[PDB]
Scaffold this motif. Structure first.
Motif, mmCIF file in Angstrom:
data_model
loop_
_atom_site.group_PDB
_atom_site.id
_atom_site.type_symbol
_atom_site.label_atom_id
_atom_site.label_comp_id
_atom_site.label_asym_id
_atom_site.label_seq_id
_atom_site.Cartn_x
_atom_site.Cartn_y
_atom_site.Cartn_z
ATOM 1 N N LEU A 42 0.829 -1.200 0.000
ATOM 2 C CA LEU A 42 0.000 0.000 0.000
ATOM 3 C C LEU A 42 0.866 1.253 0.000
ATOM 4 C CD1 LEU A 42 -2.763 -1.053 2.563
ATOM 5 C CD2 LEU A 42 -2.921 -1.036 0.068
ATOM 6 N N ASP A 43 1.883 1.280 -0.856
ATOM 7 C CA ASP A 43 2.785 2.418 -0.924
ATOM 8 C C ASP A 43 2.031 3.673 -1.364
ATOM 9 O OD1 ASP A 43 2.277 1.737 -3.529
ATOM 10 O OD2 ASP A 43 4.338 2.044 -4.222
ATOM 11 N N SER A 44 2.715 4.814 -1.254
ATOM 12 C CA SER A 44 2.085 6.090 -1.573
ATOM 13 C C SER A 44 1.790 6.220 -3.064
ATOM 14 C CB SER A 44 2.969 7.242 -1.099
ATOM 15 O OG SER A 44 3.102 7.235 0.312
ATOM 16 N N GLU A 45 2.710 5.768 -3.921
ATOM 17 C CA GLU A 45 2.530 5.961 -5.358
ATOM 18 C C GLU A 45 1.298 5.225 -5.866
ATOM 19 O OE1 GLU A 45 5.869 4.829 -7.744
ATOM 20 O OE2 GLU A 45 5.040 5.695 -9.584
ATOM 21 N N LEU A 46 1.117 3.971 -5.449
ATOM 22 C CA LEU A 46 -0.039 3.210 -5.912
ATOM 23 C C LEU A 46 -1.339 3.854 -5.450
ATOM 24 C CD1 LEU A 46 -0.939 0.499 -7.356
ATOM 25 C CD2 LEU A 46 -1.085 -0.442 -5.042
ATOM 26 N N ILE A 47 -1.382 4.318 -4.199
ATOM 27 C CA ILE A 47 -2.582 4.981 -3.696
ATOM 28 C C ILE A 47 -2.873 6.237 -4.506
ATOM 29 C CG2 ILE A 47 -3.612 6.121 -1.705
ATOM 30 C CD1 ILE A 47 -2.439 4.193 0.106
ATOM 31 N N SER A 48 -1.851 7.067 -4.732
ATOM 32 C CA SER A 48 -2.036 8.260 -5.550
ATOM 33 C C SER A 48 -2.477 7.915 -6.964
ATOM 34 C CB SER A 48 -0.746 9.079 -5.590
ATOM 35 O OG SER A 48 0.265 8.401 -6.315
ATOM 36 N N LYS A 49 -2.084 6.744 -7.467
ATOM 37 C CA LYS A 49 -2.523 6.287 -8.778
ATOM 38 C C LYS A 49 -4.020 6.016 -8.832
ATOM 39 C CE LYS A 49 1.955 4.184 -9.825
ATOM 40 N NZ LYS A 49 2.683 2.911 -10.077
ATOM 41 N N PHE A 50 -4.690 5.951 -7.684
ATOM 42 C CA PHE A 50 -6.125 5.709 -7.616
ATOM 43 C C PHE A 50 -6.949 6.992 -7.639
ATOM 44 C CE2 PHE A 50 -7.141 1.237 -6.985
ATOM 45 C CZ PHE A 50 -5.895 0.682 -6.778
ATOM 46 N N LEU A 51 -6.308 8.157 -7.772
ATOM 47 C CA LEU A 51 -7.041 9.418 -7.707
ATOM 48 C C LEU A 51 -8.045 9.546 -8.847
ATOM 49 C CD1 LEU A 51 -4.364 11.977 -6.492
ATOM 50 C CD2 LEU A 51 -6.732 11.895 -5.677
ATOM 51 N N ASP A 52 -7.641 9.190 -10.065
ATOM 52 C CA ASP A 52 -8.489 9.327 -11.248
ATOM 53 C C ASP A 52 -8.469 8.000 -12.001
ATOM 54 O OD1 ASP A 52 -9.279 11.849 -10.652
ATOM 55 O OD2 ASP A 52 -8.366 12.814 -12.399
ATOM 56 N N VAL A 53 -9.519 7.200 -11.814
ATOM 57 C CA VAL A 53 -9.550 5.862 -12.399
ATOM 58 C C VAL A 53 -9.519 5.936 -13.921
ATOM 59 C CG1 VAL A 53 -12.061 5.834 -12.252
ATOM 60 C CG2 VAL A 53 -10.801 3.686 -12.480
ATOM 61 N N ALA A 54 -10.325 6.823 -14.505
ATOM 62 C CA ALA A 54 -10.455 6.862 -15.959
ATOM 63 C C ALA A 54 -9.217 7.441 -16.635
ATOM 64 C CB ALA A 54 -11.697 7.664 -16.351
ATOM 65 N N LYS A 55 -8.695 8.557 -16.125
ATOM 66 C CA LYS A 55 -7.570 9.224 -16.767
ATOM 67 C C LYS A 55 -6.221 8.616 -16.408
ATOM 68 C CE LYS A 55 -9.008 13.918 -18.036
ATOM 69 N NZ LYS A 55 -8.798 15.373 -17.794
ATOM 70 N N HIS A 56 -6.111 7.952 -15.259
ATOM 71 C CA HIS A 56 -4.861 7.312 -14.852
ATOM 72 C C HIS A 56 -4.896 5.867 -15.329
ATOM 73 C CE1 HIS A 56 -4.840 10.606 -11.617
ATOM 74 N NE2 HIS A 56 -3.886 10.901 -12.482
ATOM 75 N N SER A 57 -4.319 5.633 -16.508
ATOM 76 C CA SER A 57 -4.345 4.319 -17.136
ATOM 77 C C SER A 57 -3.209 3.412 -16.682
ATOM 78 C CB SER A 57 -4.304 4.466 -18.660
ATOM 79 O OG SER A 57 -2.981 4.689 -19.118
ATOM 80 N N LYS A 58 -2.303 3.898 -15.831
ATOM 81 C CA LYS A 58 -1.198 3.063 -15.379
ATOM 82 C C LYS A 58 -1.679 1.848 -14.599
ATOM 83 C CE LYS A 58 3.251 3.421 -12.991
ATOM 84 N NZ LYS A 58 4.099 4.365 -12.210
ATOM 85 N N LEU A 59 -2.903 1.884 -14.079
ATOM 86 C CA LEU A 59 -3.480 0.766 -13.346
ATOM 87 C C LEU A 59 -4.443 0.022 -14.264
ATOM 88 C CD1 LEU A 59 -4.015 2.329 -9.822
ATOM 89 C CD2 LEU A 59 -3.013 0.067 -10.213
ATOM 90 N N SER A 60 -4.232 -1.283 -14.411
ATOM 91 C CA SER A 60 -5.067 -2.077 -15.301
ATOM 92 C C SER A 60 -6.510 -2.092 -14.813
ATOM 93 C CB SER A 60 -4.527 -3.504 -15.403
ATOM 94 O OG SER A 60 -5.423 -4.338 -16.117
ATOM 95 N N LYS A 61 -7.445 -2.066 -15.764
ATOM 96 C CA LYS A 61 -8.861 -2.041 -15.415
ATOM 97 C C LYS A 61 -9.289 -3.323 -14.709
ATOM 98 C CE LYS A 61 -10.275 1.058 -19.168
ATOM 99 N NZ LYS A 61 -11.072 1.174 -20.420
ATOM 100 N N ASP A 62 -8.741 -4.467 -15.127
ATOM 101 C CA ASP A 62 -9.208 -5.749 -14.607
ATOM 102 C C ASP A 62 -8.968 -5.861 -13.106
ATOM 103 O OD1 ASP A 62 -10.217 -6.606 -17.002
ATOM 104 O OD2 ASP A 62 -8.482 -7.839 -17.539
ATOM 105 N N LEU A 63 -7.775 -5.477 -12.646
ATOM 106 C CA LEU A 63 -7.482 -5.551 -11.219
ATOM 107 C C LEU A 63 -8.378 -4.612 -10.423
ATOM 108 C CD1 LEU A 63 -3.588 -5.864 -11.250
ATOM 109 C CD2 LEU A 63 -5.185 -7.490 -10.213
ATOM 110 N N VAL A 64 -8.638 -3.417 -10.957
ATOM 111 C CA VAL A 64 -9.535 -2.483 -10.280
ATOM 112 C C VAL A 64 -10.931 -3.078 -10.166
ATOM 113 C CG1 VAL A 64 -10.555 -0.189 -10.369
ATOM 114 C CG2 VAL A 64 -8.165 -0.516 -11.036
ATOM 115 N N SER A 65 -11.417 -3.700 -11.243
ATOM 116 C CA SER A 65 -12.734 -4.326 -11.206
ATOM 117 C C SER A 65 -12.776 -5.459 -10.189
ATOM 118 C CB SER A 65 -13.109 -4.840 -12.595
ATOM 119 O OG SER A 65 -12.209 -5.847 -13.023
ATOM 120 N N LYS A 66 -11.715 -6.268 -10.132
ATOM 121 C CA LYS A 66 -11.676 -7.384 -9.192
ATOM 122 C C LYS A 66 -11.712 -6.918 -7.743
ATOM 123 C CE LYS A 66 -9.189 -10.500 -12.323
ATOM 124 N NZ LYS A 66 -7.910 -11.212 -12.596
#
Lengths: 160, 193
Positions: free
Chosen positions: B28-52
């Motif tokens: 639960l590092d800071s960068e990954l959490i900050s990557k969750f700020l904008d789900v649609a515009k921040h594409s660095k996080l795969s959609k499938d894992l977010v859905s799961k």
């Protein structure tokens, strides 16, 4: 390291310290009494009681399991009875170990509280190191303690 | 082979709780959490894992990202408040304290939920695979402290003094027997020569 991550780690450590403080406060009033040792003894005796109840039920079934076609069921019941008996012997061993080497409840509780205080001090030291980012010092302290403590009761089979 | 007291058992429970919280924080590092700020515009996080991820888990992730983003400017102020910074704004200090307390509450909620959802922690581990070596060292030190404290609290206070009073004699006799075996080995070597 990132300041947010360090702050979260410090918060977790202080939460653990607060849990320890709450446990000590709850133990403050009368938990120092043998009521907690009695409760552990009662839980172990309840496990022993469950084992004895299962053994007695199996024995009753075997006595009432008069039938040729059920010999496999009788063998299974005998195996379960054997397992229950082994469990009972182990539980008796554990309970006797409790009753023999813990003659002084007062001294044992005092040492447990002293260990709790030592661990809370260690947690605060870890928090200070994290705020100072001195992870190497924390690792060195853990290594030193590991080297120091070393052995006990292993001496028995060591002498064997 | 060493039984544990109620207080020592509670200490062990808190030990496991702290270890689990540390392991959860590892992913639960800071960068990954900050990557969750904008789900649609921040594409660095795969959609499938977010859905799961569960709805509560995703809500906690978004809230933690927002809190961290808000508190980023004030983290340094909180850290340096202990120093000579007397001229810090009263309103700024109050806002920083409130943001810190909300962040702590949200992080505690996320940790509690993750400990209650094995799939949540599994997915969290899935998203992040690079673990800080210092984090691994801290986890191993936590385990070492846990084991040593189990060793301490698995021993009766009378047995604790045994380590000094009677276990002194036991360890001295162990050394005597080891050195006697060394002497017999030396005798065997000399006799073979």
């Amino acid at each position: 390291m990132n300041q947010i991550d360090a702050h979260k780690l410090t918060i977790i450590l202080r939460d653990a310290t607060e849990r320890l403080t709450f446990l000590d406060t709850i133990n403050r009033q009368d938990d120092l009494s043998s009521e907690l040792a009695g409760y552990e003894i009662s839980k172990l005796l309840k496990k022993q009681k469950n084992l004895e109840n299962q053994y007695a039920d199996l024995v009753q079934l075997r006595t009432s399991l008069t039938g040729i076609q059920n010999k496999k069921n009788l063998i299974e019941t005998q195996t379960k009875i054997v397992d229950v008996a082994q469990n009972l012997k182990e539980s008796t061993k554990k309970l006797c170990r409790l009753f023999k080497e813990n003659p002084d409840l007062e001294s044992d509780a005092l040492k447990v509280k002293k260990d709790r205080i030592q661990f809370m001090a260690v947690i605060e030291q870890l928090i200070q190191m994290v705020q100072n980012n001195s992870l190497t010092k924390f690792q060195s302290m853990t290594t030193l303690e590991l080297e120091d403590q070393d052995r006990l009761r292993k001496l028995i089979f060591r002498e064997k | 082979g060493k039984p544990t007291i109620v207080e020592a058992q509670r200490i062990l429970k808190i030990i496991d709780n702290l270890s689990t919280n540390l392991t959860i924080f590892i992913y639960l590092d800071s960068e990954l959490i900050s990557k969750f700020l904008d789900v649609a515009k921040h594409s660095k996080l795969s959609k499938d894992l977010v859905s799961k991820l569960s709805q509560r888990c995703l809500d906690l992730l978004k809230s933690q990202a927002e809190i961290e983003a808000k508190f980023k400017p004030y983290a340094s102020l909180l850290d340096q408040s202990n120093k000579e910074a007397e001229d810090v704004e009263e309103e700024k200090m109050i806002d920083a304290e409130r943001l810190r307390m909300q962040l702590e509450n949200n992080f505690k909620d996320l940790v509690r939920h993750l400990r209650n959802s094995p799939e949540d922690f599994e997915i969290i581990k899935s998203m992040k695979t690079n673990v800080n070596p210092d984090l691994n060292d801290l986890v191993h030190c936590i385990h070492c402290q846990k084991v040593i404290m189990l060793k301490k609290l698995s021993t009766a206070s009378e047995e604790d003094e045994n380590h000094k009073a009677q276990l002194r004699d036991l360890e001295e006799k162990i050394e005597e027997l080891e050195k006697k075996k060394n002497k017999i080995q030396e005798d065997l070597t000399k006799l073979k020569e």
